[PDB]
């Protein structure tokens, strides 16, 4: 008998770090009544099969950790001390701050007389670390209070993916899932360090290799990922579009594309109108004065009924495919090799290996994560990967897909719940000031007159109405529509995003900030500015596991507490293994997890913190009145709680949705109170509520499908690893998106040995079919307006085809592909004192700002201090020896780090000059551990893309100098 686990209760959980979604087993002493005694991998979980990387493997040390917060702390204005206070005091005073700030700032109408009903004096950051039910409740609490400045992590690493993949396929999500990587014949890892940043993914990546796959890593650095790939191809920072453009040209020149798939399922046959053109690096319709495109110059030619014309023969000169060929003919090997720094030999090797997957019996996948997709044209980077995958027939198939790796455990879910300024839950847009009615809101949805085009978004009025019924069930949806805030139609969308929030804070334009489950004092670019800007807040609420650089910014480096008037409330939340709820992993698996030990000390789950906070705000409004109380007073929070506690189960059932009356829908009768079985049965007339239509199907009358732990599989399911009875994924358990593209028009798989779906005896067998309908009767991309995978993507701000524009401003002066050097729809100083390209990235052992992992002694043990990785060539130039202390400096700040001199970094040759890169982990911060160092974001600029609102963390100019000590 193992004494350690004797007398302890075993429960299951899901790792609280990255988006792989590994399963845990937690043992809790005293048969559940004591503390955790052991945490390790769940041997039965189909993704990790008991494996854990060091972050998952140390969760015991995260939870049973005497450095955790134990109770609320209060920091009075100009004080230098925390005072421990009760939850009642902290939440009552916060509710008072919220109400006073809202009452003083609330705007019913904007300066144009349009209804907006919002407060602009509070902002909120966070968080992908909360459970899905907590994320959904949190956004609705914020919007009921009138907030529009609602952001979190997803803005940086997730937001570029969504329009890029939605333009191409109709949805922004990762198209396949982790287990499916083992079905791939060629895995291209580009803009991802997956062996360190999604480690259990290499279980499946190496299993593909075991079956004969070629693994290719394309990265400026040699990493732990590169060590285990067949091909490591170095690429110069920011040269990804040339690399991918060369691959497009290669595919097209060599007729390696899958003609039948391309002809039927992409928009290759659509006829582009005569107004489209491309010249000198500019698409037609360019407005030079405003550096913006009139996208109507890119329109398709339409037939009598408004459907884009098609030439299925693919011979018309204005067919997408023929315009595609013309566009990429400039991306020849020698130019691509010159700019990428990849040898022509390696380019040919990579191109041949990957384009071989255009055969229907071979599948290729692309894995990318954050990489350098945040600059001006990162969306076009992703667009090019999507176009390559469509040309090769790799979308919809097992071992194919665009596997855009999500970062954090629940960043998929927190985005699904609308914790970004521009979206409500379920990717319904936040209304702007000119959507004055629900009918105007609904009128913006594009329609299609192609009877083969499903155009599923035409159902949006059902989802909007059902969401409004979930918040305000006793109101008509058109009435409830007026309760929620609207953004200004005149303003640029990025005015409401991450980077402008820090900007407005530095200008004193926010009275209050919620730092909910985030550490902006380390995670925001240009940390010196942000740390100072936090001092301009009246009040700051930090909800977090530990005291940290954000909660305690007022006593950070160079800070005088006596000069800083900000009132701070630190509210300690409980860790993942101390609460129940769900998290949605990168493959959209919505996985239920259970409480092991009870919350440590006096910590609380986020859901209880926010609900008690909101209830106190409600009480103040019922006693005092104030600005527009109705959205607060009428919010349906009864459905969120049970046993006087926040209820994950009840919130999850409301997010799924249920019938508010007896209703007839889709040819069946439903009783009041029944769970909605799928989003197909939602309605627009108020018969249904649903907090998030994507969740309709996750928690039905059959029970909690997210909590299924059933490994049952048919032979065809098990052959590719669908595990359809393990948990639940949106939408309606379709595990591989776009799987109708995986079959021909009789319903037979292109690749029978790896079938995803198959038409058998009048039904689709295998995965859940992505879009109902007989074989050959529907276009396969049902969320697209026109139904096709988009090679030509005319909704993108930079043009309908990706085009190289230099993202490296300082060391490059020439664009070999056009006279247009930088992005034409997009002020680096390039001070010559800072001649090296700094970059930040991750290591396996630490998590994000390191707030969590710098508190875990076993992880500090392996990676104790900030380090700086440099080439042997740069170390020689600067006289730096390995292990020396160096000072890294920028126009923004300076820090010291330990030099790591390694051939894993090599100089870039740019225009005949060696250009040196300097690598830093952003995992460190002044609070802990001793001598760990501070955040690499002291160096980064707060300048970001005009069009994405993301700061530059992958290429910023620095100097590196040896720090000397005594002889």
């Amino acid at each position: 008998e193992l004494q350690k686990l004797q007398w302890a209760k075993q429960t299951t959980s899901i790792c609280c770090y990255c988006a792989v979604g590994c399963g845990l087993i937690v043992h809790t002493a005293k048969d559940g009544q004591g503390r955790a005694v052991n945490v390790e991998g769940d041997p039965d979980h189909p993704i990790n099969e008991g494996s854990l990387c060091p972050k998952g493997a140390s969760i015991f040390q995260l939870g049973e950790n005497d450095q955790r917060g134990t109770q609320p702390l209060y920091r009075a204005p100009f004080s230098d001390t925390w005072k421990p206070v009760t939850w009642d005091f902290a939440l009552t005073e916060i509710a008072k701050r919220i109400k006073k700030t809202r009452d003083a700032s609330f705007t019913e109408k904007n300066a144009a007389g349009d209804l907006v009903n919002r407060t602009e004096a509070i902002a909120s950051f966070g968080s992908a670390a909360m459970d899905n039910e907590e994320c959904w409740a949190y956004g609705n609490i914020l919007r009921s209070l009138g907030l529009v400045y609602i952001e979190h992590q997803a803005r940086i690493x997730h937001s570029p993916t969504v329009p890029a993949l939605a333009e191409s396929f109709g949805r922004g999500a990762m198209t396949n899932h982790w287990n499916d990587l083992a079905n791939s014949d060629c895995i291209l890892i580009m803009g991802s360090n997956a062996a360190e940043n999604h480690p259990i993914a290499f279980k499946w990546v190496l299993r593909a290799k075991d079956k004969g796959a070629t693994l290719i890593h394309v990265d400026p650095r040699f990493t732990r990922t590169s060590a285990r790939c067949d091909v490591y191809a170095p690429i110069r920072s920011g040269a990804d579009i040339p690399f991918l453009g060369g691959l497009i040209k290669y595919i097209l020149d060599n007729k390696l594309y899958f003609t039948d798939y391309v002809r039927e399922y992409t928009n290759a046959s659509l006829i582009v109108g005569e107004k489209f053109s491309f010249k000198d690096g500019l698409f037609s319709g360019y407005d030079a004065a405003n550096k913006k495109y009139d996208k109507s110059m890119w329109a398709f030619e339409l037939d009598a009924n408004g459907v884009p014309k098609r030439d299925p023969a693919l011979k018309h000169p204005r067919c997408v495919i023929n315009l595609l060929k013309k566009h990429y003919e400039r991306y020849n090997l020698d130019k691509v090799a010159a700019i990428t720094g990849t040898s022509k030999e390696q380019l040919q090797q990579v191109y041949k290996a990957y384009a071989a997957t255009g055969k229907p019996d071979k599948a290729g996948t692309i894995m990318y994560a954050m990489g350098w997709t945040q600059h001006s044209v990162g969306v076009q980077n992703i667009r090019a990967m999507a176009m390559i995958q469509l040309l090769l027939g790799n979308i919809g198939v097992a071992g194919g897909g665009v596997n855009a790796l999500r970062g954090e455990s629940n960043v998929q879910g927190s985005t699904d719940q609308g914790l970004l300024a521009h979206i409500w839950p379920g990717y319904n847009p936040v209304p702007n000031s000119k959507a004055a009615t629900l009918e105007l809101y609904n009128a913006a949805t594009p329609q299609s007159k192609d009877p083969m085009s499903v155009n599923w978004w035409q159902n949006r009025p059902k989802y909007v109405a059902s969401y409004l019924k979930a918040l305000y069930p006793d109101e008509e949806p058109a009435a409830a529509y007026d309760y929620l805030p609207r953004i200004d139609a005149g303003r640029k969308l990025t005015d409401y995003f991450w980077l402008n929030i820090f900007e407005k804070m530095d200008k004193g334009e926010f009275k209050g900030l919620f730092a909910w489950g985030m550490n902006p004092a380390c995670g925001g670019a240009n940390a010196n500015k942000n740390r100072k800007a936090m001092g301009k807040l009246e009040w700051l609420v930090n909800v977090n596991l530990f005291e940290n650089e954000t909660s305690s910014f007022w006593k950070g480096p160079g800070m005088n507490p006596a000069e800083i008037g900000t009132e701070v409330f630190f509210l300690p939340c409980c860790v993942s293994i101390e609460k129940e709820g769900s998290v949605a992993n990168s493959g959209r698996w919505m996985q239920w997890r259970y409480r092991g030990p009870k919350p440590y000390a006096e910590t609380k789950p986020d859901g209880d913190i926010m609900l008690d906070m909101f209830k106190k705000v409600r009480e103040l409004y019922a006693k005092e009145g104030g600005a527009y109380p109705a959205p607060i007073a009428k919010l349906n929070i009864a459905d969120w709680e049970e046993h006087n506690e926040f209820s994950p189960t009840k919130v999850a059932k409301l997010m799924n949705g249920y019938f508010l009356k007896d209703t007839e829908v889709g040819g069946k009768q439903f009783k009041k109170g029944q769970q909605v079985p799928s989003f197909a049965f939602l309605t627009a007339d108020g018969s249904t509520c649903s907090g998030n239509w994507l969740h309709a199907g996750s928690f039905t009358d059959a029970g909690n499908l997210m909590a299924r732990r059933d490994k049952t599989q048919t032979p065809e399911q098990a052959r590719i690893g669908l595990f359809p009875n393990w948990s639940f994924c949106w939408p309606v358990n379709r595990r591989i998106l776009y799987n109708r593209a995986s079959v021909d028009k009789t319903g037979k798989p292109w690749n029978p040995a790896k079938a995803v779906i198959e038409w058998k005896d009048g039904k689709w067998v295998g995965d859940v079919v992505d879009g109902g309908g007989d074989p050959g009767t529907k276009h396969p991309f049902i969320m697209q307006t026109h139904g096709f995978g988009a090679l030509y993507g005319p909704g993108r701000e930079e043009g309908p085809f990706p085009e190289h524009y230099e993202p490296l401003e300082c060391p490059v002066s020439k664009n070999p592909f056009s006279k247009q050097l930088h992005n034409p729809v997009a002020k680096a100083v390039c001070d010559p004192r800072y001649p090296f390209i700094g970059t930040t990235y991750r290591v396996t052992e630490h998590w994000q700002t390191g707030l969590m992992t710098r508190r875990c002694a076993w992880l500090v043990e392996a990676e104790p201090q900030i380090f700086c990785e440099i080439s042997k060539e740069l170390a020689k130039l600067r006289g730096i020896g390995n292990g020396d202390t160096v000072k890294v400096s920028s126009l923004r700040g300076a820090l010291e780090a330990v030099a790591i001199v390694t051939e894993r970094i090599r100089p870039f040759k740019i225009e005949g000059v060696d250009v040196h890169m300097v690598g830093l982990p952003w995992h460190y911060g002044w609070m802990v551990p001793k001598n760990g160092g501070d955040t690499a974001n002291l160096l980064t600029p707060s300048a970001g893309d005009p069009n994405t609102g993301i700061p530059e963390t992958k290429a910023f100019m620095v100097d590196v100098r040896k720090v000397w000590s005594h002889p």
């Binding site: 854990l52 990387c53 279980k203 040699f222 396996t844 392996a862 104790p864 330990v898 790591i900 390694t902």
Partner: protein, 214 residues
């Protein structure tokens, strides 16, 4: 008995095994600092039974040969650490007759610890400065006898770590060696007839660690 097969050609140096070993036994962390390497702790110690060693080797063309070596007691079939300890006190080092695990006991404080360490061809034993007890990997013998995999085997994401009966593990090591040789012509098994932790090295084992093999 039991045996590990450790296929270093699959290792991503994630260090899950390093952390899992300490979680299962609730071992303390050492004081470390970065001296120009991701490797840490720099060495095995009384509180560190496994550490992943990092070695970079130049190669023609881009990249490097990055060699990762999760070091642990080899659980020798005929352990000389036991032979040396038995000179001072039998029972300080014992061998589990079912698993083959070589086990240090509290009686190691009563033997010449330095000579026990010097007897080991792999330089594995480590001494506590306070108590003079010896420590090392114990094969997670507790877990094994109760039907669980060793913590570092269970946690491994890549299939580097393998554990089982010696005959299946030896057959696996031989078949994996033949396959791995097609990419790494210099691949070899470390002392496979003498130890219970059989590493597959992709080249000269001493490039992974000076004591990688006897």
């Amino acid at each position: 008995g039991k045996m590990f097969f450790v296929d270093l050609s699959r290792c991503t140096a994630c260090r899950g095994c390093q952390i899992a070993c300490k979680q299962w036994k609730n071992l303390p962390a050492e004081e470390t600092r970065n001296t120009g390497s991701h490797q840490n702790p720099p060495d095995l110690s009384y509180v560190t039974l496994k550490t992943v060693r990092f070695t970079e080797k130049s190669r023609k063309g881009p990249g490097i040969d990055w060699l990762f070596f999760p070091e642990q007691c080899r659980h020798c079939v005929e352990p000389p650490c036991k032979g040396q300890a038995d000179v001072d006190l039998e029972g300080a080092v014992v061998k589990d007759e079912t698993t083959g695990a070589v086990l240090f006991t509290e009686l190691t404080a009563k033997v010449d610890g330095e000579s026990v360490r010097s007897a080991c061809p792999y330089d594995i034993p480590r001494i506590d400065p306070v108590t003079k007890r010896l420590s090392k990997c114990d094969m997670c013998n507790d877990r094994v006898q109760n039907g669980l995999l060793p913590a570092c085997v269970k946690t491994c994401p890549t299939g580097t770590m393998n554990f089982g009966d010696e005959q299946e593990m030896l057959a696996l090591a031989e078949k994996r060696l033949a396959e791995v040789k097609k990419t790494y012509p210099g691949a070899v098994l470390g002392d496979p007839n003498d130890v219970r932790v059989v590493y597959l090295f992709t080249r000269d084992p001493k490039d992974f660690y000076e004591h990688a093999v006897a």
